[model samples]
Target chain A: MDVFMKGLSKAKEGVVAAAEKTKQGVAEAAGKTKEGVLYVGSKTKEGVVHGVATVAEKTKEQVTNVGGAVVTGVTAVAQKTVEGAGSIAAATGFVKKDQLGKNEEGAPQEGILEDMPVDPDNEAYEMPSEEGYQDYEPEA
Target chain B: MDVFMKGLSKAKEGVVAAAEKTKQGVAEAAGKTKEGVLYVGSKTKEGVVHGVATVAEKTKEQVTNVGGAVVTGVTAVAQKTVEGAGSIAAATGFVKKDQLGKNEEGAPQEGILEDMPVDPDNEAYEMPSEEGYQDYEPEA
Candidate 1:
C-alpha cells in the first residue's frame, strides 16, 4: 500500500509538472508574439512614412523642373522683347547707338531676368537610406 | 487503511482536474493572444499604407499648385513681352496704325497664352473619406 501511494504521488507530480511546462510555453509564445507585433507595427509605420516621403521628393523634383522651364521661357521672352525694342529704338532714333544693348543700369539686357525663389517647403522632403517594413518577420 | 486509500485517490483526482483546467487556460490564452497579434498586425499594416497614401496625395496637390504657379508666371511674362513689343513697334512706326493692337493673325494678343498641360500622375493622387488607424485598439 505504501508503494501504491508513492506511485500515485509520482503520477500527480508528473501531471503538475507537465501543466507548469505548458503554462510556460504559452507565456513564451505570448511574449514572442507581442514582440513580433510591436516590431511589425513600428517598421510598417516607418515604411508608410518613407513611401510618402519618396512621393514628396519626386513631386518636388518635378515642380523644380517645371519652375526651371518656366524661368527659361520667361527669360527667352524677355530677351527677345529687349532685342526687338533695341532694334526698333535704334532704327527710329529713340535711343543712342551706344545704349542699344544696355539696360537702364548699363548692364547687358540679355542677363536681366532673375530666378524666382522656390518655396522652402517644396525643397524640404527627404528620406533615410534604409528601406522600412521589408525586414518584418511575421513568425518572430 | 481503506479510508486513506480513498482519500489519496480523491486527492489525485483533484490534482488531475486542476492540471487539466490549467492546460485549458494555457490553450485559451495562447489562442486569444495569437488572434490578437494577427489582428493588430493586419490593422497596423493597413494604417501604415493609408498614411503613405495620404502623404502622396498631399504631395501631388502641392506639385500641382506649383505647376499652376509656373504656368501663371510664364503666361504673365509672355503677355508682357508681347505688349512691350507691340508698344515699341507702334511707337517706332515699325507697324501700321491699324495693326497697333493686333497680332500676326489679327487676334487679340492679350489672350494668347494657353494653359500648360498638367501631368496625369501629378493629378492622380486621391484618398478615401475614412481616416485610417484612428480606430486601432491595442487590446484587440
Candidate 2:
C-alpha cells in the first residue's frame, strides 16, 4: 500500500507538470498571435500611406503633362493666327515687308509656364497658378 | 491503511481531472486565437481594397478638374491673342472694320472638347484624345 501511494503521488506530480507546461504554451501562443496582429496593422498602415503618395505623385505628373499639351496647342493656334494677320498686312500693302515678318516671328508658339510638380494628396495642396496664362501676350 | 489509499486515489483522480480541464482550455484558447487572427486578416484585406478604390476615384476626379481648368486658362489666353491680332490689323488699316471683327468673333474662345470624365485606375486606362486639340483651328 505504501508503494501504491508513492506511485499515486508520482502520477499526480506528472499530471501537474503537464498542466503547467500546457498553460505556458497557451500563453506563448496568445502573445505571439498578438504580436503578429500588431505587425500586420503596422504594415497595413505603411502600405496605405505609401500607396496614396505614389498615386498622388503620378496623378500630378499626368495632369501637368495634360496642362502643357493644352497650352502648347493653344499657343500654336495663336501663332498661326498672327502669321495670317501678317500675310493679310503684306498683301494689303499697309505694312512694309520688314514689319510683316517681325510680329509673326516673335509670337509665342510655346507655353510660358514651366511645368511645376504638385502633390494633391497633401493637406496643403495648391492648384497650379493662372499667372502664366495671364502673362502670355502674343505679339501681333 | 485503506483510508490512506482511498485519499491517495481521490487526490490522483483530482489532479487527472484538473489536467484534463487545462488541456481542454489550451485547445479552446488556441482555436479562438486562430479564429481571431483569421478575422483580422480578412478585415485588413477588405479595408485595403476599399481604401484603394476610394483613392483611385478621388484621384481621377481631381485630375479631371485640373485638366478642365488648364484648358479653360489656355482657351482664355488664345482668345486674348486673337483680339490682339484684330487690334493690330485695325490699327494698321490692312483690313476693313467688318473683316477685323469677323475672324476675331469666330475664334474658339472655349475648348472644343466636352469635359469627358475618365477613370485612370482601370486596367485599360486611356488618356484623353489629342483629336480635339487638332480640331481647334483658329480663323484669322
Identify the candidate with maximal DockQ.
1
Superposed on all Cα atoms, model 1 deviates from the true structure by an RMSD in Å of: 38.0
Tens-place lDDT digits, model 1, residues B30-124? 42343233233333332122212323333233333222123221111121223344245212112222212323464343543558864465553
Query: How many clashes show up in model 2?
Result: 0
- Go through the candidates in order and give each one's C-alpha lDDT: 0.33, 0.31
lDDT of 1 at B27: 36
After superposing candidate 1, which stretches have Cα over 4 Å from the reference? Answer: A1-31, A34-140, B1-15, B18-29, B32-140
Give Cα distance to truth, residue A133, candidate 2, Å: 66
Q: Please, what are the lDDT tens digits per residue for candidate 2 over residues B1-140? A: 46574565553433434435435444333423332332333223211211122223232323332222232111111111233342342121131222222233444544345588764755534467654446775752
lDDT of 2: 0.31
For each candidate, the DockQ is 0.08, 0.05
In Å, residue A20's CA in model 2 sits off its true spot by 22
- The superposed Cα distance between candidate 1 and the true structure at residue A99, in angstroms, equals 37
